[PDB]
Amino acid sequence: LPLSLLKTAQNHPMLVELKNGETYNGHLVSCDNWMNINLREVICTSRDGDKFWRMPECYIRGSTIKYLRIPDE
């Protein structure tokens, strides 16, 4: 059920916060069974609010993902 909700969250905005305090706000486009995420147009910012870089595509592993903020829709 979390995996089906992540697979149904294609082309939706999200914010992936890692275990190391790094945050990436983007739009998830691909998901796997091992919680691996591939997102388009992701902006990376630190825990204190310092934005590091911007990438048109990003890949985040499920083992390094701490939290995933999705909107109420």
């Binding site: 059920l1 909700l5 275990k19 919680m35 939290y67 999705i70 109420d72």
Partner: protein, 95 residues
């Protein structure tokens, strides 16, 4: 069998690996501890600002971060008690 089917669609408090409690409602559950919850709110800042306590809704917490989940005896919706900010902060799971 120790499953989380009894805590679905009910008020429950989940503890993170950093040592933060969050009260919400687990919408769905699986064989991994990673679960999706709704109406997530903190408990350490509810006594100072009630508007800033509710951070977001419908977020998925990972299995490596969730330590313990306890069910609350919620009689009805939008009812919560036992909140304080004059307590010692809990430590993390790593030592």
């Amino acid at each position: 069998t120790s499953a989380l089917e009894n805590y679905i669609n009910r008020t429950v408090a989940v503890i993170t690996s950093d040592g933060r409690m969050i009260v919400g409602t687990l919408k769905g559950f699986d064989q991994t501890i990673n679960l999706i919850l709704d109406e997530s709110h903190e408990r350490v800042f509810s006594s100072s600002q009630g508007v800033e306590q509710v951070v977001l809704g419908l977020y998925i917490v990972r299995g490596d971060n969730v330590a313990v989940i306890g069910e609350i005896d919620e009689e009805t919706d939008s009812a919560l008690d036992l909140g304080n900010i004059r307590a010692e902060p809990l430590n993390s799971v790593a030592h």
